[PDB]
Amino acid sequence: MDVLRTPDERFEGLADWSFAPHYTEVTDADGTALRIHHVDEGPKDQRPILLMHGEPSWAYLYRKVIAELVAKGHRVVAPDLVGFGRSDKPAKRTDYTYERHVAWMSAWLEQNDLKDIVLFCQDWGGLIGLRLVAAFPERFSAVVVSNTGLPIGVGKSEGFEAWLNFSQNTPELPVGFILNGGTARDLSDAERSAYDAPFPDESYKEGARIFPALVPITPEHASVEENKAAWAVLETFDKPFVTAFSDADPITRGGEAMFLARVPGTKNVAHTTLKGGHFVQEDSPVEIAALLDGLVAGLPQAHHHHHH
Amino acid sequence: MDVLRTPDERFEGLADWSFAPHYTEVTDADGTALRIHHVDEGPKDQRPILLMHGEPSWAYLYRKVIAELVAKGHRVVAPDLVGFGRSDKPAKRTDYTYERHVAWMSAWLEQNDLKDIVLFCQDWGGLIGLRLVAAFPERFSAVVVSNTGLPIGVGKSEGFEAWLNFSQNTPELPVGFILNGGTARDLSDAERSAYDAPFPDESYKEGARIFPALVPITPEHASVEENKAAWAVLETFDKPFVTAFSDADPITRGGEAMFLARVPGTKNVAHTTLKGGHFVQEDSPVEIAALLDGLVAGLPQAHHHHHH
Ligand SMILES: [Cl-]
Ligand SMILES: [Cl-]
Ligand SMILES: [Co+2]
Ligand SMILES: [Co+2]
Ligand SMILES: [Co+2]
Ligand SMILES: [Co+2]
Ligand SMILES: [Co+2]
Ligand SMILES: [Co+2]
Ligand SMILES: [Co+2]
Ligand SMILES: [Co+2]
Ligand SMILES: [Co+2]
Ligand SMILES: [Co+2]
Ligand SMILES: [Co+2]
Ligand SMILES: [Co+2]
Ligand SMILES: [Mg+2]
Ligand SMILES: [Mg+2]
Ligand SMILES: [Mg+2]
Ligand SMILES: [Mg+2]
């Protein structure tokens, strides 16, 4: 693969983002080494709260959630998907596939040897993060899903399809503008600029351009088979599994029901509806941090595992 | 469903079979209540060693293994699949499907609330038993697979296909004769009669007739999707998972490799090749019992789980 790397000057002076970058080198099956970025804040003796972003955001989306949780004594880890943030960015849309993202982030997870994880995932952060849970369930102590899903090509998803068709018809993808359109609150120019930071020009956006087309909404899509298999693992996942979808995101709203129907770990936890749009982290960051803090505190009294 | 029930007189005076019958009523989705038979020998405070038979045998196949393990202080449980043994027998070939067998035995397993299980499975005992492991992995402390598989419609299986075509072309299925043809040692007339016992005439054999046709050897077969999903669970199964295939069964020999390739619990156990034919329990019962006894003894020092 041809690979782009955003210059570091782009990440200077960003509103409410001073977290030091960490990097991991993962090797693709084609031999290409890709550098993935994450932040890691707080004490290493605490279990990691893993925060996963989706399309077309980056770990910046969690900046307030990170600050709140760190202030409460937690360890917080937030990676950038390949194509996004401070991670490397394959140069062709055709370089990105759902299975490739899963393989890349699986390597990242194993190489950083993250365990005892409390996962919060949203959009593609969940499409990929939930595949990590299904591949490595004993690495996860609890999961929170918000405005996400694990599609299997079934039914209609017209909310999402409206976004899909727009995202493919448009000749350019104005990322800060999209973030603002998917948040109830009005993002400042500085905040929108931070979302534009990874992408000095359109050539850096090929992962952002193709992501919607990778969502498996038809039976013929790539990754339908793999996602159906992953659901069989999630049907056995009995540790706390919380839904925290927002009230004003018709793109993903329909994704919640299958978790409640199929995942045993949803039975003995309280679910909530958060206030906000698709990018709920901009609308309800304090509430998300409070939810995760309380979830962590209750783990010893909840169902848990040993010997991994 | 129309359902046949073999008269109890058929099970009197069988060579080396005096174990008292236990019964469980399971209700099919179509409303039909089916009675399933099992034997349960030894102390209830010991973990159950669950022995599962396949086509066209019944729990009688394990009579010596049961005796050996009971003499060693173990609890042993051996059920008859619907269509077989002392279990009820739907009257039409079309009543039997792979998914129905899994549903029936899943109900059986849950209703008897078997836990801490050490499973030994062979032929369809494994095609169904391994689906129980994938559905309820925390119920299983260890698994031993012998002369079995979990097919996903891939590759060629010409050994099995030779049996398939015979089994479908033949107008009648002489069950004792088949058992003798699939065992290295010569079964006595009494032993063959015990294998014929469940089937007073051909009308009782519809489950035995169709079973080979249910094995998913083409991509279009029913249960391919479900078995691929189950494999994703087995890819996470890290408790002892032993292969004990025999040396002289070309029908199933090719089924072993995928377990060693995909199941993590195969890594830190010793695998063995048993002597004998397809129905290896007739050829090496003492060795099977010794293997299971040793496997049970080592569990506390092996990888194990808590809190289920
Ligand atoms: Cl998308
Ligand atoms: Cl068969
Ligand atoms: Co290097
Ligand atoms: Co750090
Ligand atoms: Co999306
Ligand atoms: Co559990
Ligand atoms: Co909800
Ligand atoms: Co504990
Ligand atoms: Co009754
Ligand atoms: Co008994
Ligand atoms: Co068979
Ligand atoms: Co384990
Ligand atoms: Co072997
Ligand atoms: Co222990
Ligand atoms: Mg907004
Ligand atoms: Mg706290
Ligand atoms: Mg023989
Ligand atoms: Mg013993």
Q: How many CB atoms lie within 10 A of CB B267?
A: 11
Of B151, B176, B140, B130, the closest CA to residue B279 belongs to B176
Q: Residue A302: name the closest of A260, A263, A261, A265 by CA.
A: A265
Residue B239, CA distances (Å) to B49, B144, B147, B233 in order: 15, 11, 20, 12
Query: For residue A95, what are its two tokens?
Result: 């370089």
Residues A262, A265, A270, A271, Cα dihedral to 10°: -40
CA distance B132 to B126: 9
CB contacts of B230 in chain A (<8 Å) are 232
Q: Buried (b) or exposed (e) across B201-210, using 16+ Cβ within 10 A?
A: eeebbbbbbb
Q: How far apart are CA B84 and CA B69, in angstroms?
A: 23
User: What is the CB-side half-sphere exposure of residue B35 using CA atoms within 13 A?
Assistant: 12
Q: Which residue of B has its CA nearest to A228?
A: B229
If one counts every other C-beta atom within 10 angstroms of the C-beta of residue B125, the result is 29
Residue A26 dihedral angles phi and psi, to the nearest 5°: -120, 145
Measured in whole angstroms, how far is the alpha carbon of residue A258 from the centre of its chain?
18
SS3 per-residue string spanning chain A: CCEECCCHHHHCCCCCCCCCCEEEEEECCCCCEEEEEEEEECCCCCCEEEEECCCCCCHHHHHHHHHHHHHCCCEEEEECCCCCCCCCEECCHHHCCHHHHHHHHHHHHHHCCCCCEEEEEECHHHHHHHHHHHHCHHHEEEEEEECCCCCCCCCCCHHHHHHHHHHHHCCCCCHHHHHHHCCCCCCCHHHHHHHHCCCCCHHHHHHHHHHHHHCCCCCCCCCHHHHHHHHHHHCCCCCCEEECCECCCCCCHHHCHHHHHHCHHHCCCCCCCECCCCCHHHHCHHHHHHHHHHHHHCHHHCCCCCCC
Intra-chain end-to-end CA distance of chain A, in Å: 36
What is the spatial distance between Cα B279 and Cα A145, in angstroms, rounded to a whole number?
A: 48
Between the alpha carbon of residue B169 and those of residues A264, B163, B164, the distances in Å are: 45, 10, 9
| Alpha-carbon distances of A287 from A69, A254, A300, rounded to whole Å | 11, 22, 22
Query: HSE (CB half, 13 Å, CA atoms) of A225?
Result: 10
Q: How many domains does chain B have?
A: 1
Residue B51 pairs in a beta bridge with: B120
Tell me the CATH number at A265: 3.40.50.1820
The answer to whether A16 is a known catalytic residue is: no
Chain center to CA of A88: 16
Name the minimum distance, in Å, from the CA of A265 to any CA of chain B.
Answer: 13
A131 CA distance to ligand 6 middle (Å): 18
Q: Which two tokens stand for residue A230?
A: 């992953």
- Among all ligands shown, which has an atom nearest to the Cα of A24? 3
Q: Which structural domain, as residue segments, surrounds residue B254?
A: 1-308
Chain B's closest residue to A230, CA to CA, is B232
Name the one residue in this structure whose structure tokens are 């007189």.
B9
Torsion of CA A137, A143, A148, A149, to 10 degrees: 40
Catalytic residues of B: 123, 249, 278
Residue B62 and residue B81 in contact, taking contact as beta carbons nearer than 8 Å: no
Place of tokens 């490799």: B257
Whether the CB-CB separation of B261 and B41 falls below 8 Å is answered with no
* Lookup: tokens for B115: 């836990």
Cα–Cα dist A193/A282, whole Å: 15
Beta strands across the sheet bearing B241-243:
B22-27, B33-41, B75-79, B48-52, B117-122, B140-146, B241-243
d(CA B280, CA B171): 27
Q: Which two tokens stand for residue A74?
A: 């937690």
Does the CB of B202 have a partner CB in chain A at under 8 Å? Answer: no
CA B145, CA A8: separation in Å to the nearest integer? 55
Look-up of token digits 């979302």:
A195
According to the entry, how was the structure determined?
A: X-ray
HSE of A39 in the Cβ direction (CA atoms, 13 Å)? 24
Nearest partner of B151 among B51, B258, B238, B271, judged by Cα: B258
The residue among B151, B114, B150, B110 whose CA lies nearest residue B129 is B150
Question: What is the Cα–Cα distance from A246 to A253, expressed in whole angstroms?
Answer: 8
Which neighbouring-strand residues pair with A90?
Answer: A3
A219 in contact with chain B, both atoms CB, cutoff 8 A: no
Residue A35 · residue A88 · CB < 8 Å: yes
In chain A, which residue's Cα lies nearest the Cα of B231?
A: A229
Render B37-69 in DSSP notation, one character per residue: EEEEES-TTSPEEEEE--TT--GGGGHHHHHHH
CB B278 within 8 A of CB B249: yes
Provide the shortest C-alpha distance from residue A245 to chain B (in Å). 27
Q: What is the nearest CA distance from A106 to chain B, expressed in angstroms?
A: 14
Portion 108-167 of B in contact with A at CB < 8 A: 134-138
Which residues in A50-60 are b (16+ Cβ under 10 Å) and which e? bbbbbbbbbbb
Least CB–CB distance from A305: residue in B134, B135, B306: B306
Nearest partner of B62 among B23, B112, B19, B104, judged by Cα: B19
Mark whether A278 is an active-site residue: yes
| Residue keyed to tokens 């590759």 | B155
Count of CB atoms situated within 10 Å of the CB of A118: 26
User: How many A-B residue pairs are in contact by the CB < 8 A criterion?
Assistant: 45
Radius of gyration of chain A (CA): 18
Residue B85 in contact with residue B37, Cβ under 8 Å? Answer: yes
Six token digits for residue A277: 């749009």
For tokens 């008897």, the residue is: B112
Tell me which residue in B228, B233, B306 faces A233 most closely, judged by beta carbons.
B233
Asked if B88 and B34 count as a contact pair (C-beta separation under 8 A), the reply is: yes
Q: Could you please report the per-residue DSSP string of chain B?
A: --EE---GGGGTT-TT--PPPEEEEEE-TTS-EEEEEEEEES-TTSPEEEEE--TT--GGGGHHHHHHHHHTT-EEEEEPPTTSTTS-EESSGGG--HHHHHHHHHHHHHHTT--SEEEEEETHHHHHHHHHHHHSGGGEEEEEEES-----S-S--HHHHHHHHHHHH-SS--HHHHHHHT-SS---HHHHHHHHTT-SSGGGGHHHHHHHHHS--STTSTTHHHHHHHHHHHTT--S-EEE--BSS-TTTGGGSHHHHHH-GGGTTS----BSSSSSHHHH-HHHHHHHHHHHHHTGGGS------
β-strand partners of B142 = B118
Q: How do beta strands A33-41 and A22-27 pair?
A: antiparallel
Tokens at residue B275, please? 């002597």
Decide: residue B294, CB within 10 A, 0-12 exposed, 13-18 middle, 19+ buried. exposed
Indicate the resolution in Å: 1.5
Interchain CB contact of A238 with B (< 8 Å):
yes
Cβ neighbours of residue A27 closer than 8 Å, sequence gap 6 or more: A33, A34, A107
